[PDB]
């Protein structure tokens, strides 16, 4: 990620969590990446514990997020000559969603006591509404390309861990070592403890 800081035109870690330089000293695994585009003032809505327009109908961020989000401006790739109406956003649901899941459903939301058999009538509308994306729009309406990076730690053996190449080995010296994300100081002696493969 040292070169990926500037291989793509995005703001370098405008989020909360582990320090960007300190990410080399982690043994996280099983990352999750989601791809979506937001509109203008929705940057503030994507935060752990935030309750915004996105955080009330589209994507819920739990308090124990153990990560952050990455967003940047996209006024050229996401904005063609014609209006870009290829992405929509939910506004109508009976209740809030559950964190870290998605529920896509093309269903008419009913407001009144009477039910609707998929008919947009008196008190029955659709939650999905088209984005207003145009290259001539202002900063409050420009499409922003957003990807979320999760750095949670699992008790399972980390198949990803951290990118810290390889180095030599030493024995019988009280030295500080960081193994599987845990720091400890001591010698490296030989013991006859039986180890099962797991």
């Amino acid at each position: 990620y040292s070169v990926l800081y500037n291989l793509a035109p995005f703001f370098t870690f405008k989020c909360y969590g582990v320090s960007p330089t300190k990410l080399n000293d982690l043994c996280f695994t099983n990352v999750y990446a989601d791809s979506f585009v937001i509109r203008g003032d929705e940057v503030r809505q994507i935060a752990p514990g935030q309750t915004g327009n996105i955080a009330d109908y589209n994507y819920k961020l739990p308090d124990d997020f153990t990560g952050c989000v990455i967003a940047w401006n996209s006024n050229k790739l996401d904005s063609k000559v014609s209006g870009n109406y290829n992405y929509l956003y939910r506004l109508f649901r009976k209740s809030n969603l559950k964190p870290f899941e998605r529920d896509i459903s093309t269903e008419i939301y009913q407001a009144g006591n009477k039910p609707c058999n998929g008919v947009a009538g008196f008190n029955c509308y659709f939650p999905l509404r088209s984005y207003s994306f145009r290259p001539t729009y202002g900063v409050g309406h420009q499409p922003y390309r957003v990807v979320v990076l999760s750095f949670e730690l699992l008790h399972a053996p980390a198949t990803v861990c951290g990118p810290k190449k390889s180095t030599n080995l030493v024995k019988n010296k009280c030295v500080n070592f960081n193994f599987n994300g845990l720091k400890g100081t001591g010698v490296l002696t030989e013991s006859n403890k039986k180890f099962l493969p797991f």
């Epitope: 929509l88 093309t106 009477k114 058999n117 998929g118 008919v119 947009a120």
Partner: antibody, heavy 132, light 113 residues
Framework: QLVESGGGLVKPGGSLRLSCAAS????????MNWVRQAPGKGLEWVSS????????????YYADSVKGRFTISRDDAANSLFLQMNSLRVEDTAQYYC???????????????????????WGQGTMVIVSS | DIVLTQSPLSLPVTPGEPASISCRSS???????????LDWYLQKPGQSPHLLIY???NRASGVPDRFSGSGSGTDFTLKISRVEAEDVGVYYC?????????FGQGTNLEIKR
């Protein structure tokens, strides 16, 4: 749907290309239908199709004629739509309306029966001539 | 398919008094949750048709208050209170029970001037 492209002389053994040239509009997520019309009085629906946003299945709705000869091809990525066919036997004057259904969702619809509310997005530009 | 009739096609409409149109459907619309499966389409000659009344007896699409659909049971009717020069267009009725939609014959609507 705003304008349509069509016209030209085609042999009965040839193939046409019925397309609607859209503009800034939510045509990608709106299901539509094709309705033809006789040169005299009286319309006739010919074809319909939905999008992948509604469901994994395409919610296929074919009559006898389109099952016999026609086929559909939805890009499901932009505001484009094309109609394909192989031959031509009795096709003199067809309006071929490009209207869309007044039902964003598809509910209580089988593979052969599906209620529809109304249409309001008819267009002009799909003329066919074979006698030229 | 469903056959339809258009016996009010020869309707000499005049401004000042109401006029009515009707059509016949072979199947019954009673199997519904209070939503009548009727609609009226006004086909303006030359450019594009226009939508008057959608499914059910409600007003939508910015139509004037004169247009008002009606019908309860084995009947089909449309209530028009005022007729003007902008009412040049034929009418159609449709039932959405089956996917092979087949519209009936057209009307004339000669304004008795």
């Amino acid at each position: 749907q705003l304008v349509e492209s069509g016209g030209g002389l085609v042999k009965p053994g040839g193939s046409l290309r019925l397309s609607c040239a859209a503009s800034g509009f939510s045509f990608i997520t709106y299901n539509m239908n094709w309705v033809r019309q006789a040169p005299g009085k009286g319309l006739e629906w010919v074809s319909s199709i939905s999008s992948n946003i509604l469901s994994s299945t395409s919610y296929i709705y074919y009559a006898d004629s389109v099952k016999g000869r026609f086929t559909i091809s939805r890009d499901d990525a932009a505001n484009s739509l094309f109609l394909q066919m192989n031959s031509l036997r009795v096709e003199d004057t067809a309006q071929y309306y490009c209207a869309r259904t007044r039902s964003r969702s598809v509910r209580n619809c089988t593979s052969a029966t599906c209620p529809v509310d109304a249409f309001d997005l008819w267009g002009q530009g799909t003329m066919v001539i074979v006698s030229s | 398919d469903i056959v339809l009739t258009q016996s009010p096609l020869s309707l000499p409409v005049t401004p000042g008094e109401p006029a009515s149109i009707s059509c016949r459907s072979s199947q019954s619309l009673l199997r519904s949750n209070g939503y009548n499966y009727l609609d009226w389409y006004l086909q303006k000659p030359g450019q594009s048709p226009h939508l008057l009344i959608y499914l059910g007896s409600n007003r939508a699409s910015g139509v004037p208050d004169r247009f008002s659909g009606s019908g309860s049971g084995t009947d089909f009717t449309l209530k028009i209170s005022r007729v003007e020069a902008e009412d040049v267009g034929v009418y159609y009725c449709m039932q959405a029970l089956q996917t092979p939609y087949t519209f009936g014959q057209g009307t004339n609507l000669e304004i008795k001037r």
